[model samples]
Target: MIRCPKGSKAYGSHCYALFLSPKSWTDADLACQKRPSGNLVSVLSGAEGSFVSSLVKSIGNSYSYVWIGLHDPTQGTEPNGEGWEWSSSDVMNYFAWERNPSTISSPGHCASLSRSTAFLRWKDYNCNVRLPYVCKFTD
Candidate 1:
């Protein structure tokens, strides 16, 4: 039988948890690291992205956005380069961006998933902006 950690929901071989307590991107990343085999969620596929989208719609509340594992670690030097990556996964074949990445000029380097009436797309935001986050566990 598949099992997930308490307060988490199962999908494939992993479990996910949504944390409503708002925190900056860095802090949110650290929070997930503190959990057992946990890290910020890496949405690597359409089904996984949709699952997370549904999760936010079900319980995300008034906050319209939540942090994910996507970030451009090299944004400091290569602000407009194709250097985007996921905090948890090596593969980044899928995407759910709200706008084209090249056209986006968000002040920070972290990514967030928007929970709106339409498709729950993604957006780049400042790393210091306090917001809720999602964590993934492989145990």
Candidate 2:
């Protein structure tokens, strides 16, 4: 019976604030996709990203990194200048990058967020590494 904040939007059966149990990046996306609404929520704007991050912070138990819908291609030559894309196939018309973080790296090409204090911003990490994550659904 968790409740989302007053101004948050509804996703699936619940309000926006209820945090789901931790799961690997793929699993998390799968969970949200399996929901009636189809896929884990994608934050299309900087405002939405801020709102979601605030919700995660308020819950205060995010001890490890969590996967959002952001991802970049790892196997090919990097797309021209910052080729980050949403996992849900929706065009990202809006974007908000966590300070000082970029989606490109020497080899790896996936992105995740660390609840860890040292690097709490979105970071590009090897996607194959198993990490717990949070997913959003629409009501």
Candidate 3:
């Protein structure tokens, strides 16, 4: 079973490692939403993002990219074509984007972060594609 670090909350009655196989943006959101809490786990603050990013790094897999709970749906005509918005309402109050990135992938309206390299950064990829994810919850 996946174990959350000390002080992490138990989401869905367990310490779940939020990894969802690549799917369309809508499908991915749906999958996360369907979780027991009915909301995608949001990483609203820098501390939370740091904690989760550290966890992903500790896993030590250089090839797989993990998705965080953030997306915006108002930037394109497609269902996935929203600019980018944090799943958490108060996210803007805490974290500032190091670089203002834009999502411009084909049929891309969703966003995910990748730490496959030394820096953790956001990349625009088709939401339909499968990828591992990290979810955060409070006790």
Candidate 4:
């Protein structure tokens, strides 16, 4: 059986948690990394995506977007997704983009899960924007 840490929910082989405190993407990423075996949540599959979607919703409607582990490290070079990857260094195969990633030619572009969509989807935003974020770990 899988045992998750306090305040985290277990799904499949990992424990996931949503942090309500809003912070910039960089700050949020660092916060998750400070935890044991933790990093910002990376939705690797449709099932995991659904799990996160519901998880965010269950917390009530405090915010419309929640930070995920995904980001474009190159700062929008491949505006569509070619430059996107997870902060946890996971493979960036599966995606639930609400629309093609923004073509804005600016720095610090990061992805967040949008609550407005019926199925919940990804929307790119400025990384410096303060927002709640999710984290996941296997330990």
Taking the tens digit of each residue's C-alpha lDDT, what string does model 2 give over 1-139?
Answer: 4455465455434445333466555666776676545454467666666665665664455355556777765343655535667777889787544532343346445566656533235666566666555556554
Root-mean-square deviation of every model: 2.0, 5.0, 5.6, 2.1
> Each prediction's TM-score against the native?
0.89, 0.66, 0.61, 0.89
- Distance from true location, Cα of 82 in model 3, Å: 8.8
The number of the candidate with the highest TM-score is 4
For model 4, the stretches where C-alpha displacement exceeds 4 angstroms are: 79-81, 102-108
Q: lDDT of all predictions, in order shown?
A: 0.80, 0.57, 0.53, 0.83
lDDT of 3 by residue, 32-62 (tens): 5655443344555565555556656754554
lDDT of 4 by residue, 27-125 (tens): 998999887778889998998999988888865666888999888877776745478889999888797888776544464468898878743788888
Count of clashing residue pairs in every prediction: 0, 6, 16, 0
Q: Between prediction 1 and prediction 4, which has the larger TM-score? A: 4
lDDT of 1 at 59: 61
Ten-residue segment with the worst summed lDDT in candidate 2? 96-105
Local error of candidate 4 at 74, Å? 1.2
